[PDB]
Each structure stands twice: as structure tokens, then as C-alpha cells.
Nucleic acid binder design. Sequence first.
DNA 1: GGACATGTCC
DNA 2: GGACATGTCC
Lengths: 200, 200
Amino acid sequence: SSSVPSQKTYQGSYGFRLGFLHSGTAKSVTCTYSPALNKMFCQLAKTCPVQLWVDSTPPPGTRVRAMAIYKQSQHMTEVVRRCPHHERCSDSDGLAPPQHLIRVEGNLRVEYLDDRNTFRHSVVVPYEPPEVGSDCTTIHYNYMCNSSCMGGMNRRPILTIITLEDSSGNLLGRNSFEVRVCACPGRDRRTEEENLRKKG
Amino acid sequence: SSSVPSQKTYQGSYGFRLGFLHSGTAKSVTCTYSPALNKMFCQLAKTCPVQLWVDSTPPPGTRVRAMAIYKQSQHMTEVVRRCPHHERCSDSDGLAPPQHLIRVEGNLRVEYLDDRNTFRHSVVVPYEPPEVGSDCTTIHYNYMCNSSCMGGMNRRPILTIITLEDSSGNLLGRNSFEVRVCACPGRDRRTEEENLRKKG
DNA sequence: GGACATGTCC
DNA sequence: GGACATGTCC
Ligand SMILES: [Zn+2]
Ligand SMILES: [Zn+2]
């Protein structure tokens, strides 16, 4: 069995997809999303709102997991972790282990997990349906290193894989998106989309 | 008493001064020295030959200490250390503590010291006079982080202070030089000397 | 070695 | 935000 989680999109029976806020790139903003690249550009430890959309309501006890993997085949097998510098920075919120790249803020039932076999990190919260009048649920993620962090992601792109899972562990839905954590999300999104057009 | 070692040049009664190899900058070389800037440019963990010159022979038991401090007044008080990434890299040679920035290679009597009061690191070897026919003694230093290392020197310039000390601890001589540890010593020396001329 | 990268200065 | 920085790609 593979030690690398599938990144394969699975809309599933509940019509699961992700949504992202608009947009830009007015200024080198804190967080911006490129539909063309399927890529979030954001800043170190800043809020990244991700929306969960479903057509049919998941059953009670459904959970939402986020996990990072390296996007490139050459790096897929390596566990995505915080670099040694940021790991020792004591910026923990009391819940997140200092090694974990991805945090969820503002959730009283967050769980941080480390796979006993793959050693990969993930963070889980309960799924909750939208309030009446709302079409989605929003989770605030934080990425606790820059993509460029020496001894950590080291300039390698990652994907965040979001899985919708029932109590029993059945996969109900899966989506994923590329992430670049950088100093200037607005600038870098512009640069990448222009290189896509010209050279892609 | 100051927790910051003096960088004040002291040629002393023995006529102590430093010498550096020539030069460049043919290519982005591994190690190059700028007389105008009093600055060594070198690469991570590569050999940096430093020559010790004296007019009168130091007495037996004389020692040679190297220590780094931040050059800028704003950073002088902070101890110069390896970054967390390089510290944990297990590149130790069996003698140097993994936190120490400055190593001496090729010396059977090297001592690595940490000041009980200032916590500053230094590395010491016995002073030895030149062989007959030679005008100097050469020590091979290594700098085990780049100047840019996140969580370490963090792009701040350092000075290396070389002290000639007798057995008893008397200061016989002192010299110092700025260091930039970088990927492209040749390129950066050229850039800095040109900015000195134009803007200095 | 030239171009590109990507965090920082101002 | 433009210029500069500084490690990396090729
Ligand atoms: Zn980091
Ligand atoms: Zn380092």
C-alpha cells in the first residue's frame, strides 16, 4: 500500500467541492486564489479561508481532514513538515504540535494527527452544515512555513488535500489545491499566471 | 564588563597581522578577499585559508582564537550561532559542536570553547611559527552557515576576530575581518566593491 | 555566467 | 510597489 495519500478528486455522492474567496490581485494581499492554476497563494501564518460546498447533507459525525503532500513526483514520498527554525519558534497555539505545517484556527474540536505508518501530519475538524441562508461552510487554515523555508518545504510546491470522511472513515469526498506560501502572494500569482499563458 | 569582545585591531609587540590568498574574482570562486572592504567572501563549509604574520616570534604555548560577532551595532550583543537547520544536519567532524559557526580543519589540537558568561563560541589552535623559508603560518577556517541562513545570521554581516594569546591569556595581538558566506563570493565581492565606489 | 527566485528595504 | 537580495537553474 502506498505511503502517499491519493490526490484524486472525488466529488462523490454528496457533491463535495471547495470554494475560495475573491480574489485579486489588488496589492500583494495576504491570501489569493488562482482558478487557472488551482493554486492558493498566501502568507506565513495568515488566515486562509476555504469553503466547503455540498449538494446533499453529509451524515452526523462527518469530519474534514486537511493534509499536505509535495506536488512533484520527485518529492511526493517525503513527509511535509515545518522547517527546524519555525518548529522551534514557540508559536504554538496550545493545540497544534510545533512540527505541523497546517493549522486550523477558531475551532474548539480540532484534532492534530500523525499517521502511525506514514508519519504524515493532518488536521481534522467536525464537518458542520451551512447555517440557513448560507450555501457553504468556511474553515480557516494557516500554513506555518513559507514554501521557501530552508530545511522544510525548500521551494517545493505542495498540494493541500481536503477529504470529507464519515465517522466510520469512509471517504465521502476529496478535493485538493496547490499552495504557495510566500511573502508576496499578489505578485507571485501574477507572475505564475503570466508564465502559464506565455510558456505553459 | 561588556559581553561583546573588542574588535579593536592590536598589532602588538610581535607585529601581528593577517594575510589572505589571491584573489580574483576569477569566477564565483569558493573563497575571495577584498582589501578595500576588509572582507572575506566564501562558500558554506569551504576552506578559507587565513595567514598569520608576525615580526617577532611569540613565546611557546601561544594560542590562536577565532570568534565571530555581528558587525552592526544593532546586532552586536547577539551571540553568533549556526541556524537550527544546519545545527541538526549531522555534518559534525567529530570535534566541532554542531552549534558552532566557525570550524578549524586539519588540526589535531583544535579546541572548541563556549564562554561560561557570554555563551559565545570560539575555536582555538596552538600558534606555530612558520617553517624555515616561510614568512607565515596558515590556518584553514570553515564557516558552517551562509550569512543568509534563516534563524541564524539572517543576512546580517559578521566579523571574525582573530586573537593571538599567550599561555597565560595575555592578549598579544588582535585582528579582524568582515565575512560574507554566500553562494557566489565572486559575484558578491564585485557588487559590493562597485557599490562602495559609487555610493560609499 | 546569465537568468530567475523570493524575501526585504524603503 | 519598485528596487534590491541572494540562492538556484541550466
Ligand atoms: Zn519554516
Ligand atoms: Zn545555516
